[PDB]
Design a protein around this ligand. Structure first.
Ligand SMILES: NC(=O)c1ccc(S(=O)(=O)N(Cc2ccc(C(F)(F)F)cc2)[C@H]2CNC[C@@H]2NCc2cc(O)cc(O)c2)cc1
Ligand SMILES: [Cl-]
Ligand SMILES: [Cl-]
Ligand SMILES: [Cl-]
Lengths: 99, 99
């Protein structure tokens, strides 16, 4: 399937037993999700961009379901204005940019 | 081309006769470039990033070449961690997400 970019490329994911809407974000190194509980150890991280930085909790080896694809990777949890699926998981589902 | 996401999707762009590095960023609605001189009048725009909202300068109908593909459209100028090619211009060059 091909996704055009006339609008934000949003998809539904399942993470930690919850459904969430998230943006397929090629500019994002990492996957970043709004506040929620995840299992396991975590460590703090700062990530930044336009408007400054936010503090997030880094969880590793988290399983996410994206469009029927199961993938495992790191998830950063914190006060992001939008849930985003970053390259660390986009690679796992074979997502590419094409033009 | 087809661009995988194991590394940041950095490409060369040309704007104002000069080559710059920029990121193909499906999570950015707009195109944001580091401080440079562009022609014409600008107008104000507020954009929201990961850390909050900021004011940038909006220039319209700016010629910009992205990986050799010619685009003409809105370019915002302001403090950004990297030059960002957002959906407004990704759509112009026919860029899609595929998996
Ligand atoms: N309205 C818009 O057009 C617009 C919206 C948001 C932004 S942004 O916040 O600056 N930005 C871009 C970004 C790209 C690359 C980097 C890098 F420096 F880490 F490489 C930071 C931020 C977002 C937009 N898409 C990628 C990035 N996502 C947030 C993010 C930041 C980060 O440091 C690490 C991550 O894993 C994820 C910019 C523009
Ligand atoms: Cl990862
Ligand atoms: Cl691959
Ligand atoms: Cl435009």
């Amino acid at each position: 399937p091909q996704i055009t970019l006339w609008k934000r490329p949003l998809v539904t994911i399942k993470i930690g037993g919850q459904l969430k809407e998230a943006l397929l974000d090629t500019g994002a190194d990492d996957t970043v999700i709004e506040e929620m509980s995840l299992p396991g150890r975590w460590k703090p991280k700062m990530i930044g961009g336009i408007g400054g930085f936010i503090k997030v909790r880094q969880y590793d080896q988290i399983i996410i379901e994206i469009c029927g694809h199961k993938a495992i990777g790191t998830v950063l949890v914190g006060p992001t204005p939008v849930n985003i699926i970053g390259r660390n998981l986009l690679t796992q589902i074979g997502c590419t940019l094409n033009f």
